[PDB]
Amino acid sequence: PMFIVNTNVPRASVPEGFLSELTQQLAQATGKPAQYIAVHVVPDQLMTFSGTNDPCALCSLHSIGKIGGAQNRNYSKLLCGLLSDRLHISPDRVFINYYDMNAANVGWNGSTFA
Amino acid sequence: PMFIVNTNVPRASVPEGFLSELTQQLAQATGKPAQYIAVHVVPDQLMTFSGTNDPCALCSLHSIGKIGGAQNRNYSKLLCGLLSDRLHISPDRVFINYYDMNAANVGWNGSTFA
Amino acid sequence: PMFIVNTNVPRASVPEGFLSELTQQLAQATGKPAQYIAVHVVPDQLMTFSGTNDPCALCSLHSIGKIGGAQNRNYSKLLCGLLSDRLHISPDRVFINYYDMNAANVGWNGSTFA
């Protein structure tokens, strides 16, 4: 799995250890080894949400499997709470897009996962 | 919905008010409330389009519904027009990827929209 | 086609000519003219792969067709070889997501490809 967070919160406000934290939380939540987990955090972005520039975030979670109705509900509870706790972003100014990737459309190590 | 513009135009060329303007235009074209519209502009990027580094942009528009054959042409006409008029990017150096998102794959405020 | 590379490799380590090389190699592998290829490279990112901050990359290739299990394996071999030679990123620290786009979902030049 790969998790991207794009946010207008400044780089100084991202807690040292945030990426390692997310890695760990995503391993437990998706039941996937931390070895295949990639996390990418992009602060200081020029963005608006509802027309304003208060703290917001636009996130994507791509995974091979483990995506769907119930699971995405669980992920949204977990991830909005982590962004609210550590970045101080209201949960109503977060969007998370979930992508179920086919294993043939994920390249890794010079091949794909199918 | 969410609209992301990645461009090699410098930050000082983005006009004051541009994200607010995009927010209102997208509210009117999609017919969704402005409250659920997020806009993200990424200037100063390192990019080429057709093998050259003239001004260009790579954009994405993600919405739950209101995405389709005819609608995507109207969005393209509106958005390439605004990019050309505001950022001075020619319409033939703009790509816009359109995504119809299922409500169960969009997380917001700790739940999904399903 | 459009190819995006996000990486934690510093900007100074991306060699002059890399975007043109990527254009040329994409055009040959996919058979699309260089005119419709856009390349976007984003260095200096805050990202972890497998929980560590060694050199890594998260890439996406979007194309209207020419995406498939066997084609994707060939793209992966070429692209990871290019990343490895030019940016010194190990191939097991690269993910590449592949997207086959419908023509109606790609805007270009004030309209769509449909």
For residue A67, the chain B residues in CB contact (below 8 A) are 105
Distances (CA, A) of C12 to B17, B30, C9, C45: 33, 41, 8, 13
On the 0-12 / 13-18 / 19+ scale of CB atoms within 10 A, C70 is: exposed
CA distance B40 to B2: 8
Residue C106: strand, helix, or coil = strand
The answer to whether B64 is annotated as binding is yes
Q: Count of alpha carbons within 13 Å of A66, Cβ hemisphere only?
A: 16
**Domain A1-114 superfamily per CATH:** Macrophage Migration Inhibitory Factor (3.30.429.10)
What sign for the dihedral angle of Cα B97, B100, B104, B108?
positive
- Domain range annotation of chain A: 1-114
Resolution, rounded to a tenth of an Å?
A: 2.0
Q: Verify whether the Cβ–Cβ distance A105 to C91 is below 8 Å.
A: no
Radius of gyration of chain A (CA): 14
Which residues, 6+ apart, have CB-to-CB distance to A96 below 8 Å?
Answer: A59, A60, A61, A75, A76, A79, A80, B106, B107, B108
Q: How far apart are CA B58 and CA B40, in angstroms?
A: 12
Instruction: For residue A76, give every residue at least 6 positions away whose Cβ sits within 8 Å of its Cβ, in sequence order, or none.
Output: A96, B107, B108, B110, B111, B112
Distance of alpha carbon C33 from alpha carbon A74, whole angstroms: 44
Give the pair of three-digit tokens for residue B40: 């993200």
Give the total residue count for chain A: 114
- Write out chain A residues lying below 8 Å of C67, CB-based: 105
Amino acid letter, residue B79: L
DSSP string, chain B: -EEEEEESS-GGGSPTTHHHHHHHHHHHHH---GGG-EEEEE-S-EEEETTB-SS-EEEEEEESS--SHHHHHHHHHHHHHHHHHHH---GGGEEEEEEE--GGGEEETTEE--
The DSSP result for A56-108, as a single string, is -EEEEEEESS--SHHHHHHHHHHHHHHHHHHH---GGGEEEEEEE--GGGEEE
| C-alpha distances out from residue B25 to B21, B22, B32, Å | 6, 5, 11
Beta-carbon-side half-sphere exposure of residue C49 (alpha carbons within 13 Å): 20
Number of CB atoms found within 10 A of residue B107's CB:
26
What separation, in Å, do the N-terminal and C-terminal C-alpha atoms of chain C show?
15
Q: Is the Cβ–Cβ distance between A44 and A75 less than 8 Å? A: no
Q: Are C39 and C3 in contact (CB under 8 A)?
A: yes
Would you call A97 and B105 a contact, using CB atoms and an 8 Å cutoff?
Answer: yes
Whether residues B75 and C111 touch (CB distance < 8 A) is answered with no
